[PDB]
Design a protein around this motif. Sequence first.
Motif, PDB file in Angstrom:
ATOM      1  N   UNK A 165       0.841  -1.185   0.000  1.00  0.00           N
ATOM      2  CA  UNK A 165       0.000   0.000   0.000  1.00  0.00           C
ATOM      3  C   UNK A 165       0.886   1.248   0.000  1.00  0.00           C
ATOM      4  N   UNK A 166       1.759   1.314   0.995  1.00  0.00           N
ATOM      5  CA  UNK A 166       2.664   2.443   1.122  1.00  0.00           C
ATOM      6  C   UNK A 166       3.462   2.631  -0.171  1.00  0.00           C
ATOM      7  N   UNK A 167       3.577   1.545  -0.921  1.00  0.00           N
ATOM      8  CA  UNK A 167       4.307   1.577  -2.177  1.00  0.00           C
ATOM      9  C   UNK A 167       3.366   1.845  -3.352  1.00  0.00           C
ATOM     10  N   UNK A 168       2.091   1.566  -3.124  1.00  0.00           N
ATOM     11  CA  UNK A 168       1.084   1.771  -4.151  1.00  0.00           C
ATOM     12  C   UNK A 168       0.474   3.165  -3.989  1.00  0.00           C
ATOM     13  N   UNK A 169      -0.385   3.287  -2.988  1.00  0.00           N
ATOM     14  CA  UNK A 169      -1.043   4.554  -2.715  1.00  0.00           C
ATOM     15  C   UNK A 169      -0.027   5.690  -2.855  1.00  0.00           C
ATOM     16  N   UNK A 170       1.230   5.352  -2.608  1.00  0.00           N
ATOM     17  CA  UNK A 170       2.301   6.330  -2.701  1.00  0.00           C
ATOM     18  C   UNK A 170       2.494   6.768  -4.155  1.00  0.00           C
ATOM     19  N   UNK A 171       2.855   5.802  -4.987  1.00  0.00           N
ATOM     20  CA  UNK A 171       3.074   6.073  -6.397  1.00  0.00           C
ATOM     21  C   UNK A 171       1.754   6.051  -7.172  1.00  0.00           C
ATOM     22  N   UNK A 172       1.091   4.905  -7.116  1.00  0.00           N
ATOM     23  CA  UNK A 172      -0.178   4.741  -7.805  1.00  0.00           C
ATOM     24  C   UNK A 172      -0.372   3.293  -8.258  1.00  0.00           C
ATOM     25  N   UNK A 173      -1.052   3.141  -9.425  1.00  0.00           N
ATOM     26  CA  UNK A 173      -1.311   1.823  -9.977  1.00  0.00           C
ATOM     27  C   UNK A 173      -0.044   1.229 -10.596  1.00  0.00           C
ATOM     28  N   UNK A 174       0.799   2.116 -11.104  1.00  0.00           N
ATOM     29  CA  UNK A 174       2.043   1.695 -11.725  1.00  0.00           C
ATOM     30  C   UNK A 174       2.812   0.759 -10.793  1.00  0.00           C
ATOM     31  N   UNK A 175       2.723   1.053  -9.504  1.00  0.00           N
ATOM     32  CA  UNK A 175       3.402   0.248  -8.503  1.00  0.00           C
ATOM     33  C   UNK A 175       2.716  -1.115  -8.399  1.00  0.00           C
ATOM     34  N   UNK A 176       1.409  -1.069  -8.184  1.00  0.00           N
ATOM     35  CA  UNK A 176       0.627  -2.287  -8.063  1.00  0.00           C
ATOM     36  C   UNK A 176       0.920  -3.225  -9.237  1.00  0.00           C
ATOM     37  N   UNK A 177       1.378  -2.629 -10.328  1.00  0.00           N
ATOM     38  CA  UNK A 177       1.699  -3.395 -11.521  1.00  0.00           C
ATOM     39  C   UNK A 177       3.118  -3.952 -11.397  1.00  0.00           C
ATOM     40  N   UNK A 178       3.996  -3.132 -10.836  1.00  0.00           N
ATOM     41  CA  UNK A 178       5.381  -3.528 -10.654  1.00  0.00           C
ATOM     42  C   UNK A 178       5.470  -4.549  -9.518  1.00  0.00           C
ATOM     43  N   UNK A 179       4.654  -4.325  -8.499  1.00  0.00           N
ATOM     44  CA  UNK A 179       4.630  -5.213  -7.349  1.00  0.00           C
ATOM     45  C   UNK A 179       4.372  -6.646  -7.822  1.00  0.00           C
ATOM     46  N   UNK A 180       3.444  -6.766  -8.760  1.00  0.00           N
ATOM     47  CA  UNK A 180       3.095  -8.068  -9.304  1.00  0.00           C
ATOM     48  C   UNK A 180       4.315  -8.747  -9.930  1.00  0.00           C
ATOM     49  N   UNK A 181       5.284  -7.923 -10.302  1.00  0.00           N
ATOM     50  CA  UNK A 181       6.502  -8.428 -10.912  1.00  0.00           C
ATOM     51  C   UNK A 181       7.579  -8.644  -9.846  1.00  0.00           C
ATOM     52  N   UNK A 182       7.651  -7.695  -8.923  1.00  0.00           N
ATOM     53  CA  UNK A 182       8.626  -7.769  -7.848  1.00  0.00           C
ATOM     54  C   UNK A 182       8.498  -9.120  -7.141  1.00  0.00           C
ATOM     55  N   UNK A 183       7.259  -9.481  -6.843  1.00  0.00           N
ATOM     56  CA  UNK A 183       6.987 -10.739  -6.170  1.00  0.00           C
ATOM     57  C   UNK A 183       6.335 -11.743  -7.124  1.00  0.00           C
ATOM     58  N   UNK A 184       6.651 -11.587  -8.402  1.00  0.00           N
ATOM     59  CA  UNK A 184       6.106 -12.467  -9.420  1.00  0.00           C
ATOM     60  C   UNK A 184       6.085 -13.902  -8.890  1.00  0.00           C
ATOM     61  N   UNK A 185       7.202 -14.295  -8.294  1.00  0.00           N
ATOM     62  CA  UNK A 185       7.325 -15.634  -7.742  1.00  0.00           C
ATOM     63  C   UNK A 185       7.526 -15.540  -6.228  1.00  0.00           C
ATOM     64  N   UNK A 186       6.442 -15.215  -5.538  1.00  0.00           N
ATOM     65  CA  UNK A 186       6.485 -15.090  -4.092  1.00  0.00           C
ATOM     66  C   UNK A 186       5.268 -15.795  -3.487  1.00  0.00           C
ATOM     67  N   UNK A 187       5.559 -16.824  -2.647  1.00  0.00           N
ATOM     68  CA  UNK A 187       4.503 -17.583  -2.000  1.00  0.00           C
ATOM     69  C   UNK A 187       3.874 -16.783  -0.857  1.00  0.00           C
TER      70      UNK A 187
ATOM     71  N   UNK B  47       3.345 -13.112  -1.343  1.00  0.00           N
ATOM     72  CA  UNK B  47       2.532 -12.122  -2.029  1.00  0.00           C
ATOM     73  C   UNK B  47       1.573 -12.790  -3.017  1.00  0.00           C
ATOM     74  N   UNK B  48       1.192 -14.014  -2.686  1.00  0.00           N
ATOM     75  CA  UNK B  48       0.283 -14.770  -3.532  1.00  0.00           C
ATOM     76  C   UNK B  48      -1.076 -14.070  -3.609  1.00  0.00           C
ATOM     77  N   UNK B  49      -1.261 -13.104  -2.723  1.00  0.00           N
ATOM     78  CA  UNK B  49      -2.504 -12.353  -2.681  1.00  0.00           C
ATOM     79  C   UNK B  49      -2.591 -11.369  -3.849  1.00  0.00           C
ATOM     80  N   UNK B  50      -1.447 -10.785  -4.173  1.00  0.00           N
ATOM     81  CA  UNK B  50      -1.380  -9.826  -5.264  1.00  0.00           C
ATOM     82  C   UNK B  50      -2.253 -10.315  -6.422  1.00  0.00           C
ATOM     83  N   UNK B  51      -1.776 -11.362  -7.079  1.00  0.00           N
ATOM     84  CA  UNK B  51      -2.500 -11.933  -8.202  1.00  0.00           C
ATOM     85  C   UNK B  51      -3.969 -12.127  -7.820  1.00  0.00           C
ATOM     86  N   UNK B  52      -4.199 -13.110  -6.963  1.00  0.00           N
ATOM     87  CA  UNK B  52      -5.547 -13.409  -6.512  1.00  0.00           C
ATOM     88  C   UNK B  52      -6.301 -12.100  -6.268  1.00  0.00           C
TER      89      UNK B  52
END
Length: 88
Positions: free
Chosen positions: A35-57, A59-64
Amino acid sequence: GSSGSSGEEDYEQWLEIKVSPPEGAETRRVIEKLARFVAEGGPELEKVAMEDYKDNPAFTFLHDKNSREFLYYRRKVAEIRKSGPSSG
């Protein structure tokens, strides 16, 4: 026009109702990060986050899009949202 926004501080009125279970507080430290990384920047982050933790058991919530985690993350976003950056 089909768009109306009434209220503001209410953003915190949500924090009052956290997601279940209350064990999420364990990931909160991580969630708040997003959130602090999203609400901070915006959706662009929420998009990058999905990549940052692309393979993270963790941040499995991101996708879902139906995980209490994805909820708590938004419940907090409203918090950081109100007050995030410091300039504009």
